[PDB]
């Protein structure tokens, strides 16, 4: 293991007049009131090249570049008179205007990660004093700033290529070595970023200084220098196409749980056993008269747009990391995804769209009394959500084998193709529904089990 470093230096409580911003407003504006939300701009954005990479996080859209790139000169080539170490303390203070916006944005609920189910943001708190989201600032915000320093194909919002060509010109102007350059473009990103990654051995010393003055200068959490551990994070994930994918997944799952709570408040609360509403009747079956509609049609729209974002985030992630799945990447990195089935909620199937208008919450949004109908007398068999034709050519696979609470693994059993495509889609929405009001769960479970088996 390594150690921490000096100093108590950087007493720049008022660093300088930073022209960038005092508040990172990508999830609306600070309370009072909201508005000013930045969004995950989709693929094929010209300002980010061909945008072959993943979509653009809103926080990275309003990333606090501070005074490395800045404005008041239209789009200023800001590093020609300004510096880079103001960003050292505006990683510190841009995450002090954002650890006072941790403390307000993240720790009062004007961020997405900010708000949990109902208790809020202080009942949930990691060991390092911080409401959840600063562990995702050293990881999200800090790594994204280091990414801005390095940059993938998706150039961020000010043609970061101009700043990188400046790094070639205006930062390779005798930094770090003399004008006798070392290496070239290969070993540019690791000479002016190996005495900026070799002093991100010291910018990680400087970001552990950042956290230790998040402890000693603005004291929302007081301990030694340890942001997420005294070491920089693992490689192969700091890739913007991966870290941004993880950010997108966490944000999506948090706000999906949010909409789940809202539809609880409209179909668990304000709702009934069939999740209907005031005078829901036929009519068009027992469809919602509206009380759920405007509380769940918003969920349908949200899933539509987030699917439009995820469909081709996932494709890029897979083809870049062939052999790993997007759900695999997301689910264990954020414990709030454990109830999310990105396959089910994002099925590319018109029958799925029709039969599950409200995604995995269809059974807890619009209920027509799920009921297995026997062999005769107006069989309702195809009239429910359906099943693929069985694929003949699948290969025996050892993925998704359970892991024993022994901690062991089965290590040798292979799932038959007949079983790994066993069709149990119907069962999932019912399972999601029957979290509540038990002893009806079994009643609906037997019916949906019959229809699945049939």
């Amino acid at each position, epitope marked *: 293991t390594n150690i921490n470093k000096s100093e108590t230096s950087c007493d720049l409580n008022a660093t300088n007049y930073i022209r960038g911003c005092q508040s990172k407003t990508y999830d609306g504006k600070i309370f009072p009131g909201k508005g000013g939300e930045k969004q995950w701009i989709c693929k094929d954005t010209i300002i980010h090249g061909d945008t072959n990479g993943a979509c653009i996080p809103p926080r990275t859209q309003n990333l606090c570049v501070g005074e490395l790139w800045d404005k008041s000169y239209g789009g200023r080539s800001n590093i020609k008179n300004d510096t880079k170490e103001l960003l050292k303390e505006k990683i510190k203070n841009a995450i002090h205007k954002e650890t006072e916006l941790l403390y307000e944005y993240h720790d009062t609920g004007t961020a997405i990660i900010s708000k949990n189910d109902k208790k809020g943001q202080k009942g949930k708190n990691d060991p390092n004093g911080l409401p959840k989201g600063f562990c995702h600032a050293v990881q999200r915000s800090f790594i994204d700033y280091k990414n801005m320093i390095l940059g993938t194909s998706v150039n961020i919002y000010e043609h970061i290529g101009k700043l990188q060509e400046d790094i070639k010109k205006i930062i390779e102007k005798g930094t770090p070595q003399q004008k006798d350059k070392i290496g070239g473009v290969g070993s540019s990103t690791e000479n002016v970023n190996a005495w900026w990654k070799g002093i991100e051995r010291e910018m990680w010393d400087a970001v552990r200084c950042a956290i230790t003055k998040i402890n000693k200068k603005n004291n929302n959490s007081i301990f030694n220098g340890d942001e997420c551990g005294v070491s920089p994070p693992t490689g192969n994930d700091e890739d913007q196409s991966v870290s941004w994918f993880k950010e997108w997944g966490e944000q999506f799952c948090i706000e999906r749980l949010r909409y789940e709570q809202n539809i609880r408040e409209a179909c668990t609360i304000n709702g009934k056993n069939e999740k209907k509403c005031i005078n829901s009747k036929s009519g068009q079956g027992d469809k919602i008269q509206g009380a759920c509609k405007r509380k769940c049609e918003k969920y349908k729209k949200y899933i539509s747009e987030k699917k439009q974002e995820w469909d081709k985030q996932k494709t890029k992630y897979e083809n870049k990391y062939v052999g790993k799945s997007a759900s695999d990447l997301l689910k264990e990195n954020y414990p709030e995804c454990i109830s999310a089935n990105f396959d089910f909620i994002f099925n590319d199937n018109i029958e799925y769209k029709t039969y599950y208008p409200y995604g995995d919450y269809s059974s807890i949004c619009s209920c027509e009394q799920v009921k297995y109908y026997k062999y005769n007398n107006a069989e309702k068999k195809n009239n429910k959500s359906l099943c693929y034709e069985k694929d003949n050519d699948m290969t025996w696979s050892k993925k998704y084998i359970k892991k*024993l*609470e*022994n*901690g*062991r693994s089965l290590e040798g059993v292979y799932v038959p193709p007949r079983r790994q495509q066993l069709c149990l889609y119907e069962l999932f929405p019912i399972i999601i529904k029957n979290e509540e009001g038990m002893e009806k769960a079994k009643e609906e479970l037997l019916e949906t089990l019959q229809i699945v088996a049939e």
Partner: antibody, heavy 122, light 107 residues
Framework: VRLVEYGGRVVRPGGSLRLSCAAGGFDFDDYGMSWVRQAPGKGLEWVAGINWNALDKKYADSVKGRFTISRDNPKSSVYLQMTSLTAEDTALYYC????????????????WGQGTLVIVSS | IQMTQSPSSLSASIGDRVTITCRASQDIANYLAWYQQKPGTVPKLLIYAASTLLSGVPSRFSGRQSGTHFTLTISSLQPEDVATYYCQKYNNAPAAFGQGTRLEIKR
């Protein structure tokens, strides 16, 4: 042949704490494990016991529901998660192994660890 | 399940025979082990199966059983045998230890 515990700490009353126990040349895969606590200047007291495959977990009547035991054989560790700690649970906690590989949680504790103090106070 | 161990403070002198009793309320037929603990150390298992002396233990120890009365006998008490003895039963559920008998030198 070598058991060491981690997690001994001073915790607020009603808090939580996770003790861990390693294993040495010991083949920590088919031996049951147990946790035994000794309050300062008192007699030993069995606390928890876990089977070889962790399909059988037994707890002392006093520490029940408040205590959870678990294994992780590839990591070769056994953990005790403790919650709602009272002022009376202040004790030196030992992790011990059966001296006989078997299919039961409880057995004769042949090898013991050095133990960790779990002083509980405000 | 309780394990009543008595006496609690048995005294003796070097060369004496020392007997410790560990009455068990229920039937454990022979799933009982004896533990010796000197001050400030980990316990050491002396006897298991209520009679089977563990290897390396001095042969002056012995353990016998009558129904649910288990007795540990030190034939020739030695100055390095002054400790507490615990008689933990391990048949099934609570595997509870005994109260603990503390030997002392009689002067």
């Amino acid at each position: 042949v070598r058991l060491v515990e981690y997690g001994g700490r001073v915790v607020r009353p009603g808090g939580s704490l996770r003790l861990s126990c390693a294993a040495g040349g010991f083949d920590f895969d088919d031996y049951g494990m147990s946790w035994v606590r000794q309050a300062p200047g008192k007699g030993l007291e069995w606390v928890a016991g876990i089977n070889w495959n962790a399909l059988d977990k037994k707890y002392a009547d006093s520490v029940k529901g408040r205590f959870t035991i678990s294994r992780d054989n590839p990591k070769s560790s056994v953990y005790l998660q403790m919650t709602s700690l009272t002022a009376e649970d202040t004790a030196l906690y030992y992790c011990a192994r059966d001296l006989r590989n078997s299919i039961f949680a409880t057995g004769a504790l042949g090898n013991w660890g050095q133990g960790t103090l779990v002083i509980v106070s405000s | 399940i309780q394990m009543t161990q008595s006496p609690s403070s048995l005294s003796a002198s070097i060369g004496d025979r020392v007997t410790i009793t560990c009455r068990a309320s229920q039937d454990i037929a022979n799933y009982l082990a004896w533990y010796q603990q000197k001050p400030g150390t980990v316990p050491k298992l002396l006897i298991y199966a209520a009679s089977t002396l563990l290897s390396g233990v001095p042969s002056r120890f012995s353990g016998r059983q009558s129904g649910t009365h288990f007795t540990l006998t030190i034939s020739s008490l030695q100055p390095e045998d002054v400790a507490t003895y615990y008689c933990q039963k391990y048949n099934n559920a609570p595997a509870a230890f005994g109260q603990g008998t503390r030997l002392e030198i009689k002067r």
